[PDB]
Structure 1
C-alpha cells in the first residue's frame, strides 16, 4: 500500500521536475487536490486538472520551469527548487499560530492544514489559525 500519499505526490512532482517533464500524474485525493490548488495559486505549477488513467482518477500537474540558460548546463533554473514533507505519519507536526514559520525569509511557503482549510503560512497567519504543517515549498 502507499504509505504517505502526500509525500508520494510531493515526490512525484519533485522527480518529475528534476527531468523537466511537462506533466505528471498523481492519484486523485481531495486533500491532494486542495494542495495543488495552493501550488497553482502561488505560481509553483502551471496548474493541474482531473483526468482518468485506465478508469482511475488522477491529477495531471503541469509544472513550470525558468529560462533555458547560458554556457554549459543550459538546463533551466527550477521554479520548485525545494519540496519537503514536514509532518509525516509516525511523527506529526502541528503548529500554533505563533509557531508558524517564515519560509525562506519570506520567498517560500509553508502549506498548513487548518481547521479552516488548507492555507499557506501567510493565509493561515492572517486568518489567525494554526494546524498541521504539511510541507515546505520554495
Structure 2
C-alpha cells in the first residue's frame, strides 16, 4: 500500500520530468507543501497550487530550460524503512554544493545550507541535484 507519500511525490516529479509533462498533480499534504515550497524557492519547479478542501490536490508546475529537465536527479534519503538524521556538522551537500538537500529541522523544512547557517540538523528528506 501507500506507505511513503513523500517518495511518491519525488517519483511523480521525476516521471513527469522524464515524460516532458507540463505539470504533475498529486494528493496534497502539509509536508508535501513544505517540500514543494523548498523546491520552488530554490528554482527547481515553476509554481505550485493546492486545490480542494476535503481532498486537497497539490499541483506542481515542472520547469525546463533547453527542452531539458531542470531536476536532473531527485532521491529519497530518509525513508520509512530506514530513517536518516544528521547533525549540523555532518549535513550533506549534493553535487558539491550545486545541488540541495531538503532537511527537516526543528524550525521547519529547509535546505541543507539554510540549516547549516541556522546551526541546525535534522532529518534528510531528499537530495535534489
- Report if TM-score (shorter chain) is over 0.5: yes
* Counterpart position of 2:62: 63
| Counterpart secondary structure, 2:68 | coil
Give the match for residue 13 of structure 1: 13
Partners of 1:4 and 1:95 in 2: how far apart?
20
Q: Which has the higher helix share?
A: 2
Identify the residue that residue 99 of structure 2 maps to in structure 1.
108
Compute the displacement of 1:131 (Å): 0.3
Cα root mean square deviation, aligned? 1.3
Unmatched 5+ stretches in structure 1: 68-75
1:27 aligns with 2:23: no
TM-score, normalised with respect to structure 1: 0.90
Q: What's the offset of the Cα at 1:90?
A: 1.6
Q: How far has the Cα of 1:51 moved from its partner?
A: 1.6
> Of residues 113, 126, 129 in structure 2, which corresponds to 1:135?
126
Residue 96 (structure 1) aligned to one of 79, 83, 87: 87
Between the aligned partners of 1:60 and 1:102, the Cα distance in structure 2 is 28
- In structure 2, runs of 5+ residues without a counterpart are none
- Displacement of 1:99: 1.2
SS, match of residue 48 in structure 1: strand
- TM-superposed CA distance for 1:31, in Å, is 0.7
SS in 2 for 1:98: helix
**Structure 2 length normalisation: TM-score?**
0.96
Structure 1 counterpart of 2:69: 78
Q: Give the paired residue count.
A: 129
**Deviation readout 1:15-44 (Å, 9 max, x if unpaired):** 011111111111110111000000000000
**CA distance in structure 1 between the partners assigned to 2:90 and 2:25 by the alignment:** 33
Aligned equivalents of 1:108, 1:57: Cα separation in 2: 29
